[model samples]
Target: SVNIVDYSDCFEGISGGAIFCNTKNKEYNIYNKELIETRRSPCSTFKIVSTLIGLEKGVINSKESVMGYDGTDYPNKNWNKNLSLEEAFKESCVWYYKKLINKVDAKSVQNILDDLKYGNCDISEWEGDLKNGKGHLNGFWLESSLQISPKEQVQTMAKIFEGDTNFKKEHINILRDIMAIDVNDANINVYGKTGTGFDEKNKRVDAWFVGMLEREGDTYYFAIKSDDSNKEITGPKVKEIAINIIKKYYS
Candidate 1:
């Protein structure tokens, strides 16, 4: 089961909050409860969905499959090269996904998102153009028309963890394996995805890290999000906060 236990100390008088829940019980724990329902763009965190779509649609065979770069340059140097599914996910390469725009049909994508009940099920519309900062054809998870709350993120992630969506066992296996990024002192592997970006006004408002803790018997589903733009609000920071809370409560 998911629990946000002992997290107030980490939230530590901060302006943002987190959401944790266990799908087994259909309940959740949050730092400041209402924030769970407030919607916001999911940022790169939507890669989880895009990867699933790519796999389920037969665009990608496995994490080892190669995706070539578009030859475009960004402020970040690493994205200029081609990458594997796992590498692309770790690097959060937007163009790797962009390459699949033609392969992943919009109606199919929307249908999957709708059936899965992700973030208000609103991927039907694009906020802006794909090339510009406006948005992408399938990048609704960006700072575009699509939006979801941290609570919904946790909930949907749990569904993903449980193979509750339209995905098959094979796709779920690859996704589950790739979601984990690091290990903790308890030796419990941590699995999560992160999203970071500025809003339309160019003010960064959402910093997200949401995933599962692979415990000995069961996995714990959790999500952490904040808008402390002044600080380095990133996935690693969110993971740090999570590990802090876990350390405080587990011992």
Candidate 2:
């Protein structure tokens, strides 16, 4: 029987958020059940799917996959230079994926999302939402059109980690390699992505950490989401929260 544990206290001081974990030990630990089912912009976390698409479509390769820097000045120094897929992913380089996704095309991306049943699978604003003044040929996943809930985030990750997806094993492995994260627990292997959303005023509004945990050949999938209007909730913040929750769970 799967056990259900509530860890609302772990999310204290946040305006709103949820953590959904499907443990290898047959447990479904959750917080903020309603929000877990609520979908919001995926932010940079969409890179997980985008990376896979880029690989499968031959837009990039695992070994020699470097995207040329267009000499655009980015606030993040890490994105200032030409970057390989690995480097771009690690840096969460928005421009890198934007160019890659453009090459991947709207039809191809839509098809893949439909196949994966990701989020609402809505890319209607792939060209960017003009009303929001975000137009710049940006993909829908950029806190624009694409939205995914914590529950769906975990479900999508489970499909990939559990070998339940049609994506090539090598492609998935490449993603796993780039998505790998080092946590304090040496016994647990973690692979995930983080995403952050900003309001019109450039204030932090939404945060996400989604990934899978592997221990003793058993896999656990999880997603953490945090949203605040008055508070600053960024991806790293939620990631720390998620990590601490994992540690507490294991202990």
Candidate 3:
């Protein structure tokens, strides 16, 4: 049985939901019912979907494969000239992801989302608009229009972990492997994705962290979501909170 060690101060003013399921028992509970069903932007977390798509289509082989960063005249500050899919993902490089999306085409990306049954209530569409002869993909508004319930989020991750998607087993495994490498928390082996989006009016940012955990033959899927007063919070903060939450319950 999983226990709720702490909930106070763990999340505040955030419109997100989390579920802790004991695979052995198949029982789960949600922290916030209202926020769990409310549709919010997914931000960079949607990149995981793109990552799975790229892997299945063979657009990226290993995390070591170099991807060109075409920094036009737009101040190449913080741009990595070349990066592997793994490194790019770790850093959340927008250019590298754009290049990958280009190879797969907008329709193809939408198709992958459809196949995954991401958004049942709404139709999924690509949110890229051409700018200055280049394409700019909108993070929140465009992609995550596919609203997901906390239950759906865990189920999708389970399918990916189980290698039961339309993707080949090797491709699915590779995604799980890459996620493992991106885990900065040493306390637990966490495989997950993070998303952050801006809320203009409230001057806050919405955040999401969803993934699976593996320890001593026990596997669990979890999600943590929050809306911060400012956009200054980093993804690492959310990840750290997730680790702490897991340790509180599992340890």
- Specify the highest-lDDT model's number: 2
Which regions in candidate 2 have their CA more than 4 angstroms from the true location?
Answer: 1-4, 19-26, 130-137, 199-204
Ranked candidates (lDDT, high to low) = 2, 1, 3
Q: List the residue pairs that clash in candidate 3.
A: 14-227
Model 1: per-residue Cα lDDT at residue 40: 84
Model 2, 150-242: lDDT tens digits are 888888888876788888898998898989998867899988899887755545577889988877766778888877775568888888888
Worst 10 residues of 1 by lDDT: 128-137
Query: What is the C-alpha lDDT profile of model 1 across 47-77, one tens digit per residue?
Result: 8888888898888989897776668767778
Q: How well does candidate 1 score on lDDT at residue 43?
A: 81
* Model 1, residue 225: C-alpha shift (Å): 0.8
Q: Estimate TM-scores for all models.
A: 0.86, 0.90, 0.80
**Residue 234, model 1: Cα distance from true site in angstroms:** 2.8
- Give candidate 1's error at residue 158 in angstroms: 1.6
Q: Evaluate residue 206 in candidate 1 and report its C-alpha lDDT on the 0 to 100 scale.
A: 74
Instruction: Write down the TM-score for model 1.
Output: 0.86
**Which candidate number maximizes TM-score?**
2
RMSD of 2: 2.5
